[PDB]
Design a protein around this ligand. Structure first.
Ligand SMILES: *[C@@H]1O[C@H](CO)[C@@H](O[C@@H]2O[C@H](CO)[C@@H](O)[C@H](O)[C@H]2NC(C)=O)[C@H](O)[C@H]1NC(C)=O
Ligand SMILES: *[C@@H]1O[C@H](CO)[C@@H](O[C@@H]2O[C@H](CO)[C@@H](O)[C@H](O)[C@H]2NC(C)=O)[C@H](O)[C@H]1NC(C)=O
Ligand SMILES: *[C@@H]1O[C@H](CO)[C@@H](O[C@@H]2O[C@H](CO)[C@@H](O)[C@H](O)[C@H]2NC(C)=O)[C@H](O)[C@H]1NC(C)=O
Ligand SMILES: *[C@@H]1O[C@H](CO)[C@@H](O)[C@H](O)[C@H]1NC(C)=O
Ligand SMILES: *[C@@H]1O[C@H](CO)[C@@H](O)[C@H](O)[C@H]1NC(C)=O
Ligand SMILES: *[C@@H]1O[C@H](CO)[C@@H](O)[C@H](O)[C@H]1NC(C)=O
Lengths: 158, 318, 158, 318, 158, 318
């Protein structure tokens, strides 16, 4: 693949066809919805699993209690280090994950299509197939929701 | 001739996220999980208004410092970092930090008179004043305690008792005067050797004045040291002294449920509500992290040393 | 693919053939064992890396030590928040990982087979291949442990 | 005609796991890593039986409260949250929480007589009793300390010494009586002004009785305040007093290695062993997490606020 | 694939050709550089995100302060457990990740090539293709930087 | 005939990493993120040399123990675990752990004479010595405080004052002698009943000697208990006593900015610099984790219970 489509605005992953009757963009609504859920459900997980019980923090010690005030500070910025480090990394890690998820979904869409088409279509290697034969919109709409009939165009490529 | 492509959505979004491998990757849609926004005010904590001490310390407020300025309940307390006036007459407050912590969050609080200033028949009840405690430029003294001195060259032994007839715990405060020589001791209290014994069902106290030569503070070298106790309902407090006794007059009805802390903040009230309060202002509690200030009170996001915590939701751009 | 097999009971990943001599199920014992190890070894890692030294927890303070009792509680439920959050997420994250691992292994098994078969077999797109020619059990058993001989059935598809 | 498929195992399993993207996903085989199961009993901690104080406080047990009921070693201590009887004669115990913590885990512990009650020749050794400390309804007093009063209108100064001739550290306890007026002081101890000085190689003590008017507790307004110290082997303890002295009779041979804590629990012993003990019952230590109770003792899984921590091992179902 | 190449020393991922003019090894410098960056950038992330502010740790309590000394120890080896567990796992997890990253990159290189070659080359199933026709070094060098011309050798395989 | 393969680099590397699924996987290139290397020495902490007390305790060093051996600043302090000599004359040091912590990191520190030993005209200033404090085998005493006793059968009341005329906070130390009988009290100080009152603008002290029978330590049964205070600039300290007073002679100019701690370590200085110091030696601070010793001082990697933390950078081998 090469880049993304500004044209495709009704979903995350999808198709762009170009036959005799003309061109068009279309989102793969099933795989787009499955993905949006996951990503959403991920963000919610990172947010909601936080416990956040009532706590009150403050300096409560005098000039002759400097040792315990120090113990307080040690644990106070002990957790500060734990939380910072893990929040920083949690984000960095799961972002790598989200972006890998997007690649997978895009390829698994491409691969679900390549299977149906077999040899009668030409893998241009840019994310497109160029039919040897001709596809009306009934052809195209069959490939997208995955009801493709190979027992029709089956020989014409010869 | 005929073609079908597979592809992914892109847009005008300029937003960037980071990865454990790459940095500054542009993204379609994103989410920020770091609250970095506050309202610059002190606010109610879940309905319950805070007690803001304008420029008094908890001590001065409790004792009734005249230089200072009724609230039935609070969630937290706000002092300034250095309150202008604390102990007008120089001295000390015993187990002060514990009392502060106790008072941090009070469900009910009502000042009541327990020993009327009038009731002191054999001791001079109205000359315990000092220029260190001025009211409208006139010598005064903490309004809630009575600095008793001698009447007609004599200081009879005091025996006073108070029974907690209320349905609530009572916070009682008293004090002792540490004079600065033996001459002042006899001048004020006649008796050269004095004590103050105080007893409840749990308290067993005997205080003895400390004579010392001290630097002047607020033009006074003598000292007042204060003590407190919680008096349970149906319990009694028994005071006995032959000098230096700073008697209680007013005590406090107390109902404690939860705990909290004392916030040091320069800010002011904002007729405002929050779930999480900061010395720098109130913040929203939805996001899992914040970076405003470590010394929060409430149900607060975790405090973190980060500038941006942004999570990629969309996809890469063009 | 479509779903899992109730029939396949001797392993995690495997094959189901159907020729003239009849049908059958069979587990791919090498890839099944490699996977079981990993998953097991993962669970062990999450369990054994826990340090768990001897500690004794309790309220040890009096009515005039409420400040330090509070410091104790702060750190006590400080760690409670750290552990809860990280254990919750550790599980959620590594589960995503385990289930992705299972997909990969299933596909990498399919893909190792598609390579051998080349053009003389028909990718039905459901996880099965339908031979143009005929396969005895000697054929089938060769595909499974991966000793397939293409220099035999090589032309018959024409 | 001929076909070969690739596929994966499925079964009758109904078990569900969660993912950072999806929820309630059905699974072939699974693992739970959250121990949520306990045995509802108090148990040995790695071979070493606990010391369970039925309804005494550590203090009352040590001093020999008559209202209370030999164990050579323990791993931890179990009091109830509010033990029925603590200090039969009202009073106080100095550095009590530290002593409790010290005694939390004791390797060896043996009560020994150090000053025989008989040996008090010039002081009345057998009338230090009170109805606040009843034994079978008769006035008694802590069995391990002696409340000395005057003999024939006289209280000679006491000088007693004990040399630690044992091979072990000795825990020694004594006390002071805080009477409630001057009349009682002379009634009991003759001398109007009394002291108790106590010294070892490290201890330098001088106690002076506090007279105060106090609410009655257990029908007594006077008070007993107790003190302790650890006496090293070959060291001596030197007691000197002219009144209010609550002498030691029994002390304790002590061997401390590790530390532990005092558990508050209502449960009972179960002739049972564990590696991790809970106020609610003993638990297994294999799993990395548990959710029973935060106040554990032993080698314990991490305490977590979760209901289910389940890890997917198998695969998705049909 | 079968194993790695000792011969290939100028990069992480690459090609080994064998025509008439002779054999050779070559690194795919673009995908090799992209990968080295990521891995490096990962290690840096794990190192630099550590906060490490000035702290001083020590026993500061006496014989009658054993309770607070114990509170100190509790939090002291509280964090010891947190850090150990998370550092151990962080490593174990991200290693799985790095090694998966390497597989992906190797396959995505193979797959970018298989696309160009289509049917006129024979997938040996070991990571190599064996041309039916003949490839000079101009052919080979075109496949590597991905400027392959199929509208030339297009028919010769028949 | 003609072929093109796709493959990956391998080498002679024998290094192994671990995975959440597999173990001991051989790897092309790797990274270790666990510092396990130290230099076995004590070193400067970011330019600022430590104060190493050879074999003195902080107390003994401050008071001028004769058995002990000028430094203007330090980052941390190093005592041995049990310093050979601490309090030569047996006794005690009040709020000692707090003073230690205060002194942990001092920006400026200069010893100055505040009350000259010569200035004691009515009290014997040069006989306060003991064999417990030997200097070259001759009876001596802490060099920085003066043990005053009576002159010509008389101990007049002392009234001394010192005004802090310096621009810096002053650390002042004094003490009290706890004799072991009434005879020694009159022998040394004439007056049977003595006190020591000490006052600044914040301090209000009255100490009274404790007579007790004590085990001998360093052949002395009497005791010295020491007290300290910080005297702000322009403030005064007022000493008054009629006996047992261990007067100050030298005090300390003090400038405190940051904090630190007291390290217990047997090691020695190494003319060496670090960012992170350990009781076992200095370590590099680049790596995110270390496993040397938990009690670090500085900007330190996280302390972890691991033997190897190695991160795979290269790829699998052959
Ligand atoms: C304080 O006063 C209360 C109220 O009278 C006393 O409580 C009563 O005590 C008498 C016996 O002395 C009983 O008959 C009543 O049952 C008690 N009343 C209540 C409401 O409890 C109380 O004892 C006094 N407390 C002290 C310390 O003197
Ligand atoms: C307590 O008694 C012991 C036992 O006699 C004393 O220790 C002995 O002291 C003498 C010198 O006074 C020595 O000759 C022995 O070597 C010591 N014996 C042992 C076993 O150490 C001890 O000094 C006494 N302690 C006190 C504080 O009086
Ligand atoms: C200690 O001495 C200083 C220095 O003289 C005193 O400070 C001066 O006080 C007088 C009034 O008494 C003022 O006129 C000066 O302004 C002060 N000088 C400075 C530099 O502040 C100080 O009061 C004395 N302190 C005590 C406690 O006696
Ligand atoms: C990333 O972007 C930020 C903010 O625009 C910029 O300051 C920084 O130089 C960039 N950093 C890297 C490593 O590309
Ligand atoms: C998941 O299953 C649980 C337990 O059976 C049920 O209570 C809950 O409604 C389900 N939650 C979701 C988000 O599907
Ligand atoms: C891994 O290698 C180490 C060190 O060489 C060895 O001690 C151990 O037996 C091995 N462990 C496993 C699980 O293979």
């Amino acid at each position: 693949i090469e880049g993304g489509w500004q044209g495709m605005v009704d979903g995350w992953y999808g198709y762009h066809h170009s036959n005799e009757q003309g061109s068009g963009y279309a989102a793969d609504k099933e795989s787009t919805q499955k993905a949006i859920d996951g990503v959403t459900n991920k963000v919610n997980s990172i947010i909601d699993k936080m416990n956040t019980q009532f706590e009150a923090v403050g300096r409560e010690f005098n000039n002759l209690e400097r040792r315990i005030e120090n113990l307080n500070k040690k644990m106070e910025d002990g957790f500060l280090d734990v939380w910072t480090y893990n929040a920083e990394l949690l984000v960095l890690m799961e972002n790598e994950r989200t972006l890998d998820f997007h690649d997978s979904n895009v390829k698994n869409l491409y691969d679900k299509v390549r299977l149906q088409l077999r040899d009668n279509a030409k893998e241009l290697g840019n994310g497109c197939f160029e039919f040897y034969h001709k596809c009306d919109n009934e052809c195209m709409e069959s490939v997208k929701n995955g009801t493709y009939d190979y027992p029709q165009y089956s020989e014409e490529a010869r | 001739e005929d073609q079908i492509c597979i592809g992914y959505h892109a847009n005008n979004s300029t937003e960037q996220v980071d990865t454990i491998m790459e940095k500054n990757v542009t993204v379609t849609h994103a989410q920020d999980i770091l609250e970095k926004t506050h309202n610059g005010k002190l606010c109610d904590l879940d309905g319950v208004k805070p007690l803001i001490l304008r420029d008094c310390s908890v001590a001065g407020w409790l004792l009734g410092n005249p230089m200072c300025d009724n609230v039935p309940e609070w969630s937290y307390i706000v002092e300034k970092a250095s309150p202008a006036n604390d102990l007008c007459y120089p001295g000390d407050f015993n187990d002060y930090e514990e009392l502060k912590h106790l008072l941090s969050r009070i469900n009910h609080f009502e000042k009541i008179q327990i020993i009327p200033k009038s009731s002191w028949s054999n001791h001079e009840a109205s000359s315990g004043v000092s220029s260190a405690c001025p009211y409208l430029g006139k010598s005064s003294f903490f309004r809630n305690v009575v600095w008793l001195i001698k009447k007609n060259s004599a200081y009879p032994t005091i025996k006073r008792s108070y029974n907690n007839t209320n349905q609530e715990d009572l916070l009682v405060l008293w004090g002792i005067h540490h004079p600065n020589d033996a001459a002042e001791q006899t001048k004020l209290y006649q008796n050269p050797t004095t004590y103050i014994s105080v007893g409840t069902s749990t308290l067993n106290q005997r205080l003895v004045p400390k004579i010392a030569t001290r630097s002047k503070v607020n033009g006074q070298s003598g000292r007042m040291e204060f003590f407190w106790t919680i008096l349970k309902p149906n319990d009694a407090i028994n005071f006995e002294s032959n000098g230096n006794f700073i008697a209680p007059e007013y005590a406090y009805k107390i109902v404690k449920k939860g705990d909290s802390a004392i916030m040091k903040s320069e800010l002011e009230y904002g007729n405002c509500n929050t779930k999480c309060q900061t010395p720098m202002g109130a913040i929203n509690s939805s996001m899992p992290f914040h970076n405003i200030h470590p010394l929060t009170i409430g149900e607060c996001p975790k405090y973190v040393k980060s500038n941006r915590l942004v999570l990629a939701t969309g996809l890469r751009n063009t």
